[PDB]
Amino acid sequence: HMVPMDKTLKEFGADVQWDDYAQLFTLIKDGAYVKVKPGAQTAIVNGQPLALQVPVVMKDNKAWVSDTFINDVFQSGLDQTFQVEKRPHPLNALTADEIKQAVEIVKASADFKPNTRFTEISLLPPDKEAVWAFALENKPVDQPRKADVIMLDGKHIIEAVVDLQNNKLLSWQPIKDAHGMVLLDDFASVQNIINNSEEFAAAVKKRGITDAKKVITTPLTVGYFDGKDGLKQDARLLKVISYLDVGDGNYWAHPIENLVAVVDLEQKKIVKIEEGPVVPVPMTARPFDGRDRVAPAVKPMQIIEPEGKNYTITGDMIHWRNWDFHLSMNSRVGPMISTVTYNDNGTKRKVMYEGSLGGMIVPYGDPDIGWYFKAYLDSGDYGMGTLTSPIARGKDAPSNAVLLNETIADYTGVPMEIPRAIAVFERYAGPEYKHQEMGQPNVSTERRELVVRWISTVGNYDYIFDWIFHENGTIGIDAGATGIEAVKGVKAKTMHDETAKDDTRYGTLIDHNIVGTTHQHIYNFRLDLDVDGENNSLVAMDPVVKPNTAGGPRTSTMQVNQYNIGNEQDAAQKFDPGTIRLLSNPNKENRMGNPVSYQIIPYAGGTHPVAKGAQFAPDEWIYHRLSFMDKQLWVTRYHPGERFPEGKYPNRSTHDTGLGQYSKDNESLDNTDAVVWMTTGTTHVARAEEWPIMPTEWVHTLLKPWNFFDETPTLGALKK
Amino acid sequence: MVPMDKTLKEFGADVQWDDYAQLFTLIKDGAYVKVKPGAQTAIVNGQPLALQVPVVMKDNKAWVSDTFINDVFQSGLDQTFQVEKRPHPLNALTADEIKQAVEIVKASADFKPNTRFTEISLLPPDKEAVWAFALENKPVDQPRKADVIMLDGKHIIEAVVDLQNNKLLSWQPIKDAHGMVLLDDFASVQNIINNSEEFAAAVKKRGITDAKKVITTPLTVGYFDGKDGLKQDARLLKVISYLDVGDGNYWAHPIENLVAVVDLEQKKIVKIEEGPVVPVPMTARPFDGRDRVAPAVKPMQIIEPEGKNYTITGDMIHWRNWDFHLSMNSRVGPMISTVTYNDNGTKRKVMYEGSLGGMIVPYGDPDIGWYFKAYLDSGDYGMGTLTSPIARGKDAPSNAVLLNETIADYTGVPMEIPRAIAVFERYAGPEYKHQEMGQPNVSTERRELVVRWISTVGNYDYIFDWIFHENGTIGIDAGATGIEAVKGVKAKTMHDETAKDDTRYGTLIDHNIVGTTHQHIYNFRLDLDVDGENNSLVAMDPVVKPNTAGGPRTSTMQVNQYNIGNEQDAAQKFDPGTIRLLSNPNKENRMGNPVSYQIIPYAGGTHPVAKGAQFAPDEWIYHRLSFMDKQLWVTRYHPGERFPEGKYPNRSTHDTGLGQYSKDNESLDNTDAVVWMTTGTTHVARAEEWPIMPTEWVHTLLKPWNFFDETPTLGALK
Ligand SMILES: O=CCc1ccccc1
Ligand SMILES: O=CCc1ccccc1
Ligand SMILES: [NH3+]CCc1ccccc1
Ligand SMILES: [Ca+2]
Ligand SMILES: [Ca+2]
Ligand SMILES: [Ca+2]
Ligand SMILES: [Ca+2]
Ligand SMILES: [Cu+2]
Ligand SMILES: [Cu+2]
User: Fold this and answer.
1) Is residue A520 within 8 Å of A680, Cβ to Cβ?
2) How far apart are CA B74 and CA B223, in angstroms?
């Protein structure tokens, strides 16, 4: 029997186009570009003929296909985008089975507990040297597949290491004073605790809310205030900010200002309720999904690759032109780009052993009760990999993208597959280079970039990360921000109202009774670059104007002050976009005798004002606990255990256990394995254009090869 | 009948044949056509067309009617271009007007025999009348006039003509003004050097066996109060030379320390400066791929089968909520005029006129052949005139529409530049997005309309994109590629004796070749009229202040707001961490905030940023060009102030540009303002940029700030 084509293909996730003039169906799904005519015996897949056992049947204007059409066509093999990995890469993320295995091992230990949850179950990284040997020399990693299992027993953190190869527990170490990150069930717990709170229902009622059932809560971390917040450091707590559900699908637009409940998770009870002046709840419906809007007619635009892609995905490894890298997923920081090499006329040269988001922070600047503690560490306290948002095909990524699925473990230790977790796509990016010599034939070549996009949503914010591999050796990393703003309810409707001045002291009035509290977005990227080898050095090149001492009319000249940065303490600094910073390899030079290097650019621009550092007086705790905020560039000695800027356990941390710690010993950075950390952010002062929903804003970072090659990288293969 | 592939490709259309569907897909600009052999109809942008003569296959070769192209492409089904019945007042001079203007000044008794024309452009009606035409369809009741700037030998004469009444209005000689470099000067220079016995000897001394292989370059000499020993009243050019070795890239073969000074009216070398002899780098370094083989790539196409979202009526472009006028000028190139944003039915003013103001590429080497090198590409050479035709699908995406533009050449003859400007829409990631936990996702794609122009002056190639976002934001990016000006040096690697001295002012990017450090400084003139003519300049500086509200916090994030009332104060460095708005104090949005536009002179770049001019304040180039040292300028609207580097910058003795326009320090309070953005880079070379440099970009932005009352792209309410 057969099934309706349109319905079935849509369900499948393929785009369906019917051309009445050509009596032709064009079907697109990732790397597959298919063409099929009703009644035809063969179809075309990426330019290649495919015999069909059952042709497409057109009945009374409706097409029907065999129940095998989707598999015969899309899994034919004519789409070579994906190839089966023969020799499993050592950096492959834990499979579902491995996840379940690690969980059975710890549950087999005499100490496991029933309520024991899992904050992170991830692969334990083999030694860097063995992995490179595999990627480069194809030498097998004879070290056992291990996995880190970080558990949360109530409010206590426990670190366990399991041996997957030999199915045995290798270690079980409790971590005192450490708090665990926020977990999914805590969200449900908070809303439930508030719904059962007699006092809170009372507090809410005195603030104009009749039906307390329509109150939506939000789980926020409290941070650390040396006790000034009057909060017991020992307890596992969360503060709660509420909004009113008006039925417009956007509760963020209806804040219940000056009301904050403090919830103790293990005690499952409200341990405190801070109240401030009663402010009428903004009631006007402000939907952002278009329900109240007119759909504008727009002409279609498709980016197509009818013969397939230029990249191939073997297991988790991606090959594209001269690039080769491994892409995996982590529940905390998200995507991880590993063993990145560039094929230089036959020789795979090392570039980056491991790169990924390091961590990020979004601190607000309002002193009031519902804002003073608000300083989010999204990846660290919430797990952005876990909160990945499936890519909306054709919208969140261009129509010529390939969408990958990724698997991680949820908090209960059960394997979780995230559909459309990461997007891969090549894109036209203007001319690679060009020169129109007067009176001569023109010379131009197009530029192509391979983009790896991942989106994670934590509450009201939606973050987008792109890892851009330029064909010419350059690597870009941009961060985009969109979503819904965290607003403050105020009495003023316009700037003409008596309270306007005070209501807008910490933010712009972007709507009637609504203020967009100023805050910042600070991202940090951990880049373990191995510029053509592990032993590198950090070099600085400051362009300067010096007095002319060679004669002639000129009084000055443009020269450069070049010097090495021998230690971590000095490598941790502000970035002047007017200067040049390089991670060179003092052991290898190019054809001209210059050390092969990569230029590090933490700030290549952005669409919001740039954050010159953390907008905090040097005496604020947040500024103290987290030092990665005030420096745009950091360089440390390679250590497999140092991966987070804010520290491994930032939830209510008392001191800096991250970059401040990784560099406190001020170690030598001369000709050794270095790790670059780039910090970049924006200072967000709101405007009406960003409400009810914010247009995507971007920040750009860059890694350019500096004398890494001997000439224009894209000139082409030498003919003679 | 006639051959299809042959005919269609002569037409410039792309032909594709799908044997499986027995279908031809024809593409050219806004036309996307589909036609099957033997079919009685065809499809043009989604619409059915009846054919007089079906396409016929003859020996596997398609054949079509001799009227096919016209019947199909000029059918009317391609709505990209529309007829302009009422000519916009800012339309550039037409070929007929260019010829009329030249006839008028030639009919004057003062017109001398070999006069050349530096510029023949439209003398624009008053701003008010123009805005009235775009907003109210009110006719501009003023005759079309044209400015005709002439160069009589070395003398500049400014004249004004009345095109509607065909009469000469004024004829004014300009004292002490030097004219820009004209194309024929390029040839004079090469020819003068060739006939120079002295030069040939000078060259022989340096190792060149055949002087006929010496390639010259016409370089402006600047001004040095005489310290360079050059007469101020003489029209001069310095000549740097290269050796043509047959690799199609003479730039890779510098003849270092040899500089000739040429007097254009006397037509001879009036001074030769010789320095240390350096052997000419000989190794072949072609950049055209003659010695290379490109890797095979799977095809990629960007298609709009139903046509474009934009309409081009004459020179007026309509796209979504945007409406603007695009014209061409021989000096600065593309001009974006009468820009409005259609806010739910009402067209609101955004920008009266915007265009490249001017630019400069100054070098940092003190030596004999570099110290005077400070190029004002548009001002001294005419970037519009030197526009480089866009290479379809390469310099611009495959879904672009290529426009032809017309300007006058130096002899006053109309000149049509093919594919002078590219217009294309592009996907720019999600416009906005929110994936609420456990709810249906909300995403919309972003679309930008890019207007791209490429100009090439000598070795450098410059790209300019005017980017219109659906949400009201306007972006302006400048890209740079081409061939680097290099210095000949003795060192082959950094291990040689002279290596350190050879690389004191630049990187050693190849054997015996150093890419001399320099800067790329662009300036944009933006006559913004934020929802009206009368505006003010407001500064908003984010600052950290002590907490006075109580609670654990010791500090807060606040904004320091204040108006900048005059021109001198408006001329300032730009801190990308601050906010600068051009507000309209007379209009507010629904929340009581002044409708405004955020000015961002520096939104990023792929090369190191130029925080100012890499020159001591006592350098002459520094004195002559103040715009290099400040990223933001705001002055009162004046029709005659259009160039940051001044109107006649060749060998100028003082600042006649932005330095002069702001000198008076006038009031910028609630009045017609003009914004000037200066953005630049400091370029320290590397091997990856030789023999040809990969395109490098810089970005600027203009964002609506409380101009609207909400997300501009949500759409109209049902
Ligand atoms: O994203 C930061 C913390 C948060 C989590 C869930 C809802 C709102 C805010
Ligand atoms: O682009 C600046 C001046 C110039 C003109 C022609 C050839 C080389 C250099
Ligand atoms: N007086 C307008 C210029 C002109 C001249 C000749 C033909 C058409 C137009
Ligand atoms: Ca260290
Ligand atoms: Ca390293
Ligand atoms: Ca203005
Ligand atoms: Ca003025
Ligand atoms: Cu923000
Ligand atoms: Cu340059």
Assistant:
1) no
2) 55
**Residue A525 sits in which domain range?**
309-718
Residues A124, A229, single domain; the answer is: no
Ligand 3 atom nearest to CA at B99: 5
Q: Quick check: bond before B691 cis, omega within 30?
A: yes
Question: How far off is chain A from B594, nearest CA to CA, in Å?
Answer: 10
Separation of first and last alpha carbons in chain B:
53
Within a domain: A511: yes
Q: Do A382 and A433 reside in the same domain of the chain?
A: yes
Q: What is the CATH number of the domain that holds B241?
A: 3.10.450.40
Residues A28 and A103 in one domain: no
Cα separation values, B6 from A60, B1, B52, Å: 42, 12, 20
**B132 in Cβ contact with B125 (< 8 Å):** no
Q: Please spell the DSSP secondary structure of A494-556, one letter per residue.
A: STTSTTHHHHTTTEEEEETTEEEE-EEEEEEEEEEE-TTSSEEEEEEEEEEEEE--S-SS-SE
How does DSSP classify residue B65?
-
B24 and B161 housed in the same domain: no
Is the distance from the beta carbon of residue B100 to the nearest atom of ligand 3 less than 6 Å?
yes
Q: Is residue A213 domain-resident?
A: yes
Distances (CA, A) of B154 to B45, B116, B119: 54, 10, 15
- What residues line ligand 2, using a CB cutoff of 6 Å? B 217-219, 375, 377, 457-460
Q: Among all residues of chain A, which has the CA nearest to that of B455?
A: A436
End-of-domain residue from the set B40, B62, B78? B78
Contact A700, B701 (CB under 8 A): no
C-alpha–C-alpha distance, residues B449 and B428, integer Å: 10
Structure determined by: X-ray
When divided into structural domains, chain A yields a total of 4
Check which CATH number belongs to the domain holding A526 and give it.
Answer: 2.70.98.20
Instruction: Determine the Cα–Cα distance for residues B465 and A589; give it in Å rounded to an integer.
Output: 37
Which among A551, A605, A685 has CB closest to B542? A685
**Residue ending a domain, choose from B165, B180, B195:** B180
DSSP B131-184: HHHHHH-----S--EEEEEEEETTEEEEEEEETTTTEEEEEEEETTPPPPP-HH
Q: Is A161 a domain residue?
A: yes
CB of A275 within 8 Å of a chain B CB? The answer is no
Evaluate whether residue B52 is within a structural domain.
Answer: yes
